[PDB]
Design a protein around this ligand. Sequence first.
Ligand SMILES: COc1ccc([C@H](CN(C)C)C2(O)CCCCC2)cc1
Ligand SMILES: COc1ccc([C@H](CN(C)C)C2(O)CCCCC2)cc1
Ligand SMILES: COc1ccc([C@H](CN(C)C)C2(O)CCCCC2)cc1
Ligand SMILES: COc1ccc([C@H](CN(C)C)C2(O)CCCCC2)cc1
Lengths: 392, 392, 392, 392
Amino acid sequence: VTLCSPTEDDWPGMFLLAAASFTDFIGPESATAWRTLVPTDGAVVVRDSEVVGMALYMDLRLTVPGEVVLPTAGLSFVAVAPTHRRRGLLRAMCAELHRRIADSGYPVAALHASEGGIYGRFGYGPATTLHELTVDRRFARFHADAPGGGSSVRLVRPTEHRGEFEAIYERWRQQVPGGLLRPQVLWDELLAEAKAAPGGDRESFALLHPDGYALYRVDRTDLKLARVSELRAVTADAHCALWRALIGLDSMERISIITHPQDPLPHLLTDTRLARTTWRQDGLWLRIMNVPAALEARGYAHEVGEFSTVLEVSDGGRFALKIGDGRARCTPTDAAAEIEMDRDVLGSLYLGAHRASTLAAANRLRTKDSQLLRRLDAAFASDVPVQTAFEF
Amino acid sequence: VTLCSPTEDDWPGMFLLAAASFTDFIGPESATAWRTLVPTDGAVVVRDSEVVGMALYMDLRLTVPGEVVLPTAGLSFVAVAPTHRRRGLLRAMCAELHRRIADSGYPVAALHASEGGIYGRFGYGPATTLHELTVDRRFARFHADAPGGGSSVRLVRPTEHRGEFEAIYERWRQQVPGGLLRPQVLWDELLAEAKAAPGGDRESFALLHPDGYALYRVDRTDLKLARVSELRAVTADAHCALWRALIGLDSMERISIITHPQDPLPHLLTDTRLARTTWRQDGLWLRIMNVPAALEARGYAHEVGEFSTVLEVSDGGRFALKIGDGRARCTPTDAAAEIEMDRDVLGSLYLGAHRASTLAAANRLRTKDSQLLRRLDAAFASDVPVQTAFEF
Amino acid sequence: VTLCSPTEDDWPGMFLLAAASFTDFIGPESATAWRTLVPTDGAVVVRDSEVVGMALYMDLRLTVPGEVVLPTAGLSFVAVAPTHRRRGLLRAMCAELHRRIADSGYPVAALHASEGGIYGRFGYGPATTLHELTVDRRFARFHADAPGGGSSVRLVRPTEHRGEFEAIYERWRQQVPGGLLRPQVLWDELLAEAKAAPGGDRESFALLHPDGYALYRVDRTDLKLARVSELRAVTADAHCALWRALIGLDSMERISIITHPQDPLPHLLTDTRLARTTWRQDGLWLRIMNVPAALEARGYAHEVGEFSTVLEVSDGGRFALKIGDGRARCTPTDAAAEIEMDRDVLGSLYLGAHRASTLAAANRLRTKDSQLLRRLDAAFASDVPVQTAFEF
Amino acid sequence: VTLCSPTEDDWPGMFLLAAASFTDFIGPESATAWRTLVPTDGAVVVRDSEVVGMALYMDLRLTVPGEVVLPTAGLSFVAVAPTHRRRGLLRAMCAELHRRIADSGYPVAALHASEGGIYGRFGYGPATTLHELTVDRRFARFHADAPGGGSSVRLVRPTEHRGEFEAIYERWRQQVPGGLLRPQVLWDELLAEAKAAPGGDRESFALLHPDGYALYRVDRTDLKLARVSELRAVTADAHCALWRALIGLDSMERISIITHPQDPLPHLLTDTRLARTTWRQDGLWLRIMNVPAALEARGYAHEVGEFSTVLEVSDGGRFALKIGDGRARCTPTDAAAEIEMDRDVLGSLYLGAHRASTLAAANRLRTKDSQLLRRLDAAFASDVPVQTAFEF
Ligand SMILES: COc1ccc([C@H](CN(C)C)C2(O)CCCCC2)cc1
Ligand SMILES: COc1ccc([C@H](CN(C)C)C2(O)CCCCC2)cc1
Ligand SMILES: COc1ccc([C@H](CN(C)C)C2(O)CCCCC2)cc1
Ligand SMILES: COc1ccc([C@H](CN(C)C)C2(O)CCCCC2)cc1
């Protein structure tokens, strides 16, 4: 077993491992479009020869609180052959890619986890929360207060309005923590999946507003369920107008969407309970590669007064952290730690999805000052709720 | 149709309406113990004679942020006969009880809603969130950081340790927003439901720690599911120790609990995803009866700097609101409103369960200042997460 | 194996066979109340000794078209031990009871069939149709035309209004084909089943109108389903008023009832489709014991002009049948048959539930005259739709 | 929003609205074959431009009692964009098409309803009843009386016997109320759907008798269920022979068919209960456009003696109605009404599927004469049971 950057010759062995590892694997042509986002030296393989392990990262741009955009290494396509389990292949592949990612100057790495038990030990913390809402649209009535009581929304074919979707998404990704730049190859892929497949997905339709769009398709087996694959709204008016149109799908019983915990939809209805939470899971995981670069790069809440503390990340350094006027300064120190946590915990705090107080109650974050805990909670809170852009 | 305080003679007609209206109705003897909490003039009936409508409130004590305890009117036992629907009976009964509640000096009313679409129009807003977590305990391993790695926890018969449960709950209710005083008749009722019933519930067991207790019973139909009816933990150590014991129920596959969104349990595990959110619904609803008395009574976040605004509640007054050093002053004004909302929206903000920004995005809260929105969000936030005490 | 009238000593052996044969068997005390309706010589047993077969009939009064009431032998409690199958016990028991029934002067026998394949060969034809309607009452709105848009309906405890139920049912049974006299022991039994059982049925409630009553109970497992056990309405106004009250059970999702195919309920609603047919099965089976006495006793449709034919029942005689002015005369003849059918087919025609044309299309009824078929269809039609009274 | 006859340019916008509105939408090529049946001026669109509403009618021939064939406007392809709900688009489109249909000389309009609550208010009444029968063919034995105890039935490929299917269906449609002429484009469509689809329907087979045919296919998911899409039998012998062959599908557990309430199948079996009613819904809806032309065109039952009455249709005229010798005369009058009903109720009576007495019991039909009700019931009854031809 040796660990190497793959040559062109390795890619069929990687596609075989992929097919056998990932049921969602569309196939070589689709993976060749995601390959464009992978830099030179972005991939490792383990050969025994034949490919028994692989892992890569893609070049991404991730929006963090304060509308700051970070270069982000997106780990993906990670697989160990079922023949080579418990041989330390994952550990060796993650250590090598992390070395390259850190040396390349990325302040943050990110991934979507296939199981919740794997990535904590490599320093990844769950940083966004997926929340499925299912609306029984037969009972749904809009509240007297809800905006937009002509329609500004049009029912359209997605492929005929690519430009408008691209422009609305670009505005949304820059203003929302969790937003990711979507490269044009990923618009190619998205619009190809919109098409219906024999024995596969049904055709996707779009609802298009000047300041938002919703992409939806009827479920293959449940013909009374419409699944919203993506709703991007830049204004509250756009969000309400799009939900008025979705609730107008009179041939459906139910509309489902994978959204975020602060989605205002339930509050648009006279019965908030009609927007049922049917599923809840971790979305984007973060590994802070460079603690000072990450902490200094994001914006903090202006509401909390200036405060100074000493933060120790387990095997990640100790820092004098001063937060004031929405900005952090984070410098080396050997002064006594006032706060300690593993690297994964910092990733979970970083976008505002998890409260320092919640993590402290599990002893994942350790402090003897409850006042400092309240200050951390308030300062790391995000004004714009954190959302999940697209899986990678 | 006349509306009156019931006489002793009305109570059998009320118990008949109850039996026909509420499947959860245990029976007259149980309802006679809840009757003790109902003050003189706490009940209304509509006669046609026979009882075709009823509603009452109970005298409760509700903990709000800052560990402040308010006298609270708990509306319950509300029913209209299926023979007298759409005759305005509910509207007439709610108006009369609200008049009595306000005249009696209660700053707040509260209820548990049988449907989500009814109570908004009478000024009640959902104020707590029930979150069911189901753990697949066969995979559950505690994180290296989790506290308590002899056991301080004992498996006991609930009826033999009444004193210790009473004392732990008393400490928990005073320190937790949402906490309710539990009167001794309600301890009588709770310990009677612990007993097994032929063709009914299985026997309840307790796990008892010096600083917490968990009451649980195996599901009647699912013999591999244990349902935690109540876990009250005064310290993080007590919470972790109790979950170590629950995960040690080796004959179960699954442990379920109705908890709150900030329950630290998922963070105690190496796989956070094992604590699945299987259900989510509104818990306690609040109607603010007296806006200035309620706003002045609770504590606010010390992190946010002093600020002044003008709040209009639709048909509930306009107030100069000044929040500083964790305290509010709320005085009459005819100055221009900077914030407007219906009374129900204020109830939803009051315990910290809903963000002003979230309600603003649905246009339930109206302001032209985004800075004021961030300040309201931060100030109404609760340091101790809001929990739901017990249904009434 | 001998066949005898049971002595008092045989009854425990019969109750043992009953318990082992009938899952619906309430027990000896309940069966001892049904025993009162069984005449001297109304029962047979086969001993091997131990009881290996039994069958009995009860003295009933059955309403047929024209509001005519016939003495009816109600066969029931029919069982062969699982140890003595395929020994001709059923055939021997049915032949003996039929001999006694015919000799006693009963023009008709009736039963409720545990399977559809058994009773045709002994001359029983299905004569009524059970139709389960399930209403999704959350969508149900009454049509502008529906009657009864104070309520004349009261929600009551069944046991407190026995007299009123008895009187309404007496009026309904006399005016409805299929009606059966309900003896007071059967009112005792009905009101005992109204009571809730630990691990059993939930309590029954009644809706009481001057001209109808509905008995209903929440399903033991489905707490959002109310099952109407019995709705007896003497007027259309009573029927509509009772359904307005049932649709007002706001805590239920669904109301189900076992009714008849001509129940007007669907036509009371703006959406007829909301009253879904979820189940359909044979109800009351008839064996015509004496062809001329039965055909002469019922009323026929006044719309059809006088006509004469010759009817042959297979092994049941040949008759000159003259139908005019709503009356039949049915006399012996050896003239050529114009219509032939097995005895079971006549039972199926007798109350109007099945069309002669439908049975002719299956060749269960044989004629070469299509005009005679149309005349039979029209003449045997019932003005008041046929309903099923109560199982026996 | 303007309302217009579509130009060729509007049809892609209509196909987009169709795809988004109808999950059963096969696609443009299939809809272009149904377009042939749509006359010039048979279609309306609402533009906002883009298509936000559409509705059309097709030229059909409908068989009514007496084997009379009426020109019938078949409304279909009716959709409002989910963006333009509650703007009166349906009302405006139905009013315009009804104006054109009436002016064109159609005595009747018809449709298949996607929901039961929409079409009553535009004067459409449900006129046929779909009844799904599911037979457990493992228990099914034919009665000694059933016809056809060599087989006259052949198992064939539908596409190889098009001529014979066309000829049998032509005979059946002319002799059965509810029958519709099937144009050759609809035979093209039917035989194309017979072919199997990858990830779609399995191949269809036919059973062919000189006087009937059955088209059936194994269910895609349930491989032990055969679904009969269509059984057309001109004689009872053909019906019995076809069911003998279907019950001979020894690899199936269950045969299901969508038939009519008077299907003789259950009576062909020794156990009638084996032919279970698993589904029941409205089939064809009728709007009587011209009351006198429709009432005069159909045949009436010869059994009922001559009678005269005065019928008022709400906003549809008042008529002296004389029914005798199977014929009606229906002339204008201002004499006092003896019978009143909304137009939709007349459509429900017109083919014999609903009894005047049943509609009277719901107060949809109003009279003070019970004798007149019995006469209407008998006269509007259909000798040949009403069946549903094919959906449009
Ligand atoms: C060649 O590099 C990649 C990277 C990612 C992908 C896929 C992205 N999907 C979200 C469409 C993936 O789904 C990632 C998980 C493993 C299967 C393939 C493809 C190629
Ligand atoms: C007589 O006053 C009351 C008030 C409340 C109750 C019950 C409380 N449960 C939580 C045990 C209730 O469950 C409230 C909802 C309606 C049914 C009865 C009883 C009597
Ligand atoms: C002793 O005679 C009888 C006759 C009938 C019964 C019961 C009647 N039920 C409808 C309550 C029966 O249900 C009939 C079927 C067999 C089981 C008992 C009892 C005793
Ligand atoms: C272009 O005109 C029409 C009319 C009807 C149809 C379809 C007929 N099916 C029964 C095959 C329809 O199914 C009707 C309901 C809406 C979807 C399409 C097609 C085109």
